[PDB]
Amino acid sequence: DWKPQILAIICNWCSYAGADLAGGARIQYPPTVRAIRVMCTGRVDMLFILKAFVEGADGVLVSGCHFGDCHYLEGNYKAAKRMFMIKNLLRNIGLDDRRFRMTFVSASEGAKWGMVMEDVTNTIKELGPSPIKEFKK
Amino acid sequence: PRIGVFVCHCGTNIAGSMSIDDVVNYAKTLPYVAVADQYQYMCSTPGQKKIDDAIKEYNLTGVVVAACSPRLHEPTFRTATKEGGLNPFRFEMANIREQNSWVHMHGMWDEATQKAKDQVRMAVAKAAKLEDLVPKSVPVEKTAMVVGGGVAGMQAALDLASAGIKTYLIERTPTIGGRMSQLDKTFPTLDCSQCILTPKMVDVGRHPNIEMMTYTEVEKVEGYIGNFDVTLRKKARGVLTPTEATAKGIVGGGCNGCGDCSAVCPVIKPNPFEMGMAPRKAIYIYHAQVMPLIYTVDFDSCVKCGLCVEACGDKKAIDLEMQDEFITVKVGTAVLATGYELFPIENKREWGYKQFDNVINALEFERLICASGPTGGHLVRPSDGKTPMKVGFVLCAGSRDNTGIGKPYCSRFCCMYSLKHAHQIMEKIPGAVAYLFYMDIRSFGKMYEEFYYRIQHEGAKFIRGRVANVLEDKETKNLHVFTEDTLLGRPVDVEVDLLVLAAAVQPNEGANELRKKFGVSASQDGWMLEAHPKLNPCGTTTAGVFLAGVCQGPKDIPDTVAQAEGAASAASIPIHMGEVELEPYFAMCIDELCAGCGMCVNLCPYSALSLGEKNGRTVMVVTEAKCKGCGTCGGFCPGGAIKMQHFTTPQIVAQIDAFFAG
Amino acid sequence: AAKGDMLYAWAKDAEIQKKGECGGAVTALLKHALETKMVDAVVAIKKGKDLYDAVPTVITNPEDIIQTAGSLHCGTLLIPKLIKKYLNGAKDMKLAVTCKGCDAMAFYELAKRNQINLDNIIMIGVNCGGSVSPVTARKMISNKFGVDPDTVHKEEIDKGQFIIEYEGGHKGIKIDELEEEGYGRRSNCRRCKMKIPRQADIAAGNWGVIGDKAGKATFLEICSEKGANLVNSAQSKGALEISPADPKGIDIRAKVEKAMFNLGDEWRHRDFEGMGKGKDRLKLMMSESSKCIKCYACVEACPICYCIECSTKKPWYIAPGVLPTSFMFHLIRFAHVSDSCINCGQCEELCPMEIPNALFMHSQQVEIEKMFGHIPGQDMTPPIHAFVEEKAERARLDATGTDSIYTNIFT
Amino acid sequence: MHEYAFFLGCIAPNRYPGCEASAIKTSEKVGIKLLPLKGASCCPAPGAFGSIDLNVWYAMAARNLVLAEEMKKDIALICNGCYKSIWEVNHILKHNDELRDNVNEVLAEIDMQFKGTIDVWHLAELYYDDKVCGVQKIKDSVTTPLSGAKVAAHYGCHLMKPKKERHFGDTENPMWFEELIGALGAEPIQYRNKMQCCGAGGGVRGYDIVHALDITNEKLINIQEAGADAITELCPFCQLQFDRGQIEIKEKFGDVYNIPVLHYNELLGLAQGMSPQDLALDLHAIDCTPFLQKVL
Ligand SMILES: Cc1cc2nc3c(=O)[nH]c(=O)nc-3n(C[C@H](O)[C@H](O)[C@H](O)COP(=O)(O)OP(=O)(O)OC[C@H]3O[C@@H](n4cnc5c(N)ncnc54)[C@H](O)[C@@H]3O)c2cc1C
Ligand SMILES: Cc1cc2nc3c(=O)[nH]c(=O)nc-3n(C[C@H](O)[C@H](O)[C@H](O)COP(=O)(O)OP(=O)(O)OC[C@H]3O[C@@H](n4cnc5c(N)ncnc54)[C@H](O)[C@@H]3O)c2cc1C
Ligand code: SF4
Ligand code: SF4
Ligand code: SF4
Ligand code: SF4
Ligand code: SF4
């Protein structure tokens, strides 16, 4: 009756390329994550993550370039600081902060993208349904 | 809004993983969708015709194509959307192949169908909120810059100049030419390197469209495809060219290259052109065939004795108090041609490079064998100056090595140049024998295999075994090379008079600093990265910057020149047009929402944001040319006063909302 | 007299010195600045009615600052946001403003976000041991003290007890006892730790004044060159008397400040663990925030909320007409403010639905602080997201010892 | 005074006791305290026992390590083969979890657990380190110059190799052990192929004595050609090979060298003034008397 709802927000220049490379190389993984594709992860506002979690994302993933490998010289440092602060907010509002993570996937790491997909799915399955969906009523 | 959804089968690549009929029916029942339809190859001419007919018939506001990746087929379907009466940017893709089919092929079909329905729903939600953009066209300055004065830089500069574009040639060293100027002969044809290159050096030095700036570096670069504001450091050469002397007022001239200055200078230092084997004064030229024959002064080693100025006399070319001058130049495109250096092979201690006298590397051997080198072209042993009779060549020295000391790649030309050096010794010293300790002879190019055949015919010994270690005889200074003859099946101990290491090559010194100034990334190997490894080996991901030569990866002089002319052509494409279109992803400030806090200003790596006066209120101002569309500022601004043109917050939030719609 | 001096100060004018809570030095300095034309106006607090009513006042006539003299402990208001809204952010006129610790922190937050001109504003900071809501003070006096509240003349928190002076005598009750019974200082004042505003230009208080001047001298700490100039000018023109402070006074001032820090820590503890942990804290937060009627008083009163239009007003975040509003309303304030919350309590005390906005926000702020090391309201340090640094970002990723941002971040 | 558990394997106590005696005395003279290891055994000798069974090699080396773990001390060694066994098993079991688990459930049959809390040092490594006794401290402790003696160093193989598994730096031409011999006042000489194996490792000493002796004889020829008057070494295996094998070479071949073989601890004792009788130089196959005449 329950299937995890995981949302990914992946940059265009390394994480979308890595997911595309995994697909091209035919690396299988479970069909639980759906992606949004912004240009950089610097674009990811905090309110995007919080909006996802309040609509009912059982998990949220944000994937971007490695440090020093952003297409736009430093846009993922901003995203990293923002996601550290988001981890702190979710812990202090009492939602489980491991529902959220930020992975750094390069353009050539299709295998690592597959492993990230598998691990995110496993972690959310262990965690269970998000509590917001029943706390709303 | 009225959206059309067109679902490609990709010729069973997608229909063999999901139910295309079900996806199409779901798209029909989706809100805002006017028409939903499918085709086998939406990227083909009937597919574009299908899109255009649907647009005309159903009065479509936007188009959603559920197909392969945007990174593969945005231009195709944007042009298909334009041809049909829409804006190109009323279009959005739903990647349901490379992120649904190819990853959910096996044993899971209704799950892939549900994922496809979700992706189509999110794409439709974004496209129902996209609106019209027009790409920005920016003028292109009609100059070009070439950093590097090697063969690849000189070829690119000559190509651009003869195409008519004014070109700057920046070289850090006092002369152009590069490594090929150090080479003595060239494989596979055995031509003299300077003889074949001097004609082209003279062309570069005389061309009216080339601004040859030797002994100069690139301090900083800012700008974009349109205008690059490049600041150059004119290092204190210490000697004036005739033009500069006349400008400063000395009618008698500047430097004519007589040599009296270096005849009287008392300081003696190693010559970097001769890899240190030869002396040169504090005021010097590398070799007698340098293109600007202008006699740099080495200020780190000059003692300001003033004998040089007395020798120069009325020419008055020497200014011992000269300082680093800075110049700012505006250019349209830039070509990077930084070349390479030899990997430090003293780290491989088993081959006693620095510790045994008679172990040298291949550029030192090339200078020793050249007739213009420290010797009279006579190869002699460094230990005692006697002529060798047995010479060993250690191929793969520091290459195809996964131990962390050497390089894991092949340096491409080291098998060929070792064959050349074996030929040169066997023909220059009568009765000398060349031993090549090899592990995969790689003679792949045109006439290379024939060159290999000819060298074996002249009588070089080919021992298939990577050298294990080298011991030096204590008295004769001879070198005992220990390896196994893998084909013979026995260990060997070959005693040679001279050992030559075919060392790996690595990016030149400072190349990483320069490519970070220009915004270029690096490869896995450490060389500069190209836009697409197959179909675009010259351009980089940053627009207006192009690669040429060994700086992108090791190559022979033929391949280097082909790459250099390719880069010159790519750099000429936007200059000849004079216009270039930027991608309309810019940030646009909504002024009657900006509060003027100024906090976003420091979040732009490109300094596109600033605080300015509009209607008395201090608001933020975007230099739309400098913006690159990253979105950092617009993801920061708390009040939502920054709009990202094709990835607006309402659009992204509509995608999120559509994902959670059930 | 020079940027660090600790002084005793009282007013030369006997009437100013009587009406001051201590020696009248804040009212002598403000009067001098106004009448010598350092400043074009003065923003101070005066009683509008009974001493429970504190009304902010812009004063240009130097004859009206004797009315501003005295400290109102029921003045729970915040000044700097009024200067931005109705005095054009002090962008054209110099002001001299008397401010508590929260009012100095708010000045610095708004100056970080470029909403006021601290080059123009002069901040005379007062020590603050806490403020009481006026109506809660009335109920306190009616019930616990057994007095008719209209009888009280003056009332002050001195030595950790609530002294009131009425007709008949004076009384006193320990503020800790009152706070256990459900009265006393405001919640954020119990959690506050900005006791001596050393970020202001002058810090005035009754702590560290000992002996023959225990009620007729103000302890002044000169915290900047601008304050040194104001004090030296006032002393030379003869509106203010200056004697160097007593070292024993300095020592016990330090001890009282430190004890107030410890008490603030204890209340921070008991409150933040009173909110709960895990999914219980989410049900507390969500059930409380389901009461919000979207009056936007918290947004309009917060010093850190400076946006022309709040994102809580944008239809793609919050549905315009749905009144049992989403938790997104308060998530958007936790995301935007919690990194720099000065714990002023205005959001909590202006809420018609009695939602613990300040408690939630400060509970998040304290550990955003121990995570990033950024203390709000102390100086011109840019906000954490307005200044991201390459080396620091590398540092926090390496400290996690991990290839992502997933775990090994908290203890 | 730093304190270390003294492992003391098989050959030093049972064939060359002067080596261990001088080890204790000289280490105490410099600032080091060598404590007996309680019931230590053969470090499962890496060649002759690792060639048979790696799992029992791991188990016995781990037992030797957990003895000193219970002692709460750092191991100090004087043998390159013992260093291989002890240090390398310590390093492997500090990082490989399934091997830790396997060794622990083998050791649980004798009420004994490995947790990986101590470090293993060679005594010459300690003598070379600067925190612990350094080269200057060795020079200070030396009281008899031992001048006018040519001394050839044999590093061995298990101390320094492979360099991807150790931390002693260059294996092609190290000079650190030459500095310790130069501290004593004896001039260390360089010979051809100085980094060659002595031939006794891996059980070859037992399996094919002629092969091992040919490998040793190559070294002895090079050393005599250089002109050495003694061979210092940091391994009782290598000392046994260079000492017995000279006699076996004299009998199986017809080669005579008569080159004394001494452990570095024995030379350090000679430098610090210990007597030849107190060093038990009479227990070596090759007479040390010419070298003693030269340096005394
Ligand atoms: C021993 C040896 C023998 C060889 N023999 C042959 C042969 O026989 N035939 C053959 O075809 N190939 C041969 N090659 C390969 C050949 O040298 C290269 O293919 C060729 O030189 C590539 O030229 P390039 O212009 O790309 O680089 P380079 O020749 O290295 O030129 C780069 C230039 O850029 C300059 N530069 C570097 N960094 C900067 C900077 N930051 N700013 C400004 N200027 C900068 C350098 O000073 C130099 O002048 C040989 C190579 C070696 C090592
Ligand atoms: C609520 C409150 C609590 C305080 N608690 C302490 C404490 O625990 N310990 C301590 O040493 N000092 C405390 N003080 C400060 C104390 O009153 C100082 O000793 C006094 O301000 C010294 O100034 P003065 O008598 O020299 O000048 P005064 O003539 O008293 O000047 C006082 C100034 O403060 C202004 N003011 C009055 N009420 C407020 C208010 N609510 N907000 C802002 N400004 C106001 C007046 O307008 C006037 O300008 C507190 C002050 C307030 C307002
Ligand atoms: S558009 Fe993409 S999915 Fe469709 S046929 Fe072409 S390549 Fe295949
Ligand atoms: S003497 Fe003067 S003109 Fe002649 S080479 Fe030297 S610098 Fe040039
Ligand atoms: S000043 Fe003297 S040292 Fe310098 S270049 Fe001239 S002669 Fe040589
Ligand atoms: S080109 Fe030949 S010598 Fe050079 S690395 Fe490759 S295989 Fe080795
Ligand atoms: S756009 Fe936003 S961040 Fe930038 S100045 Fe305006 S309000 Fe501040």
Ligand code: SF4
């Ligand atoms: S999106 Fe914003 S931060 Fe990025 S380049 Fe454009 S203006 Fe600068």
Ligand code: SF4
């Ligand atoms: S918040 Fe702090 S500074 Fe402000 S009134 Fe309360 S106790 Fe005083």
Ligand code: SF4
């Ligand atoms: S002040 Fe209270 S009721 Fe008003 S918007 Fe804020 S939380 Fe809601």
Ligand code: SF4
């Ligand atoms: S959120 Fe509330 S307590 Fe925090 S600074 Fe704003 S008004 Fe003050």
Ligand code: SF4
């Ligand atoms: S909550 Fe955020 S968007 Fe709204 S006013 Fe405050 S800072 Fe601005």
Ligand code: FES
């Ligand atoms: S381009 Fe991917 S994180 Fe910036």
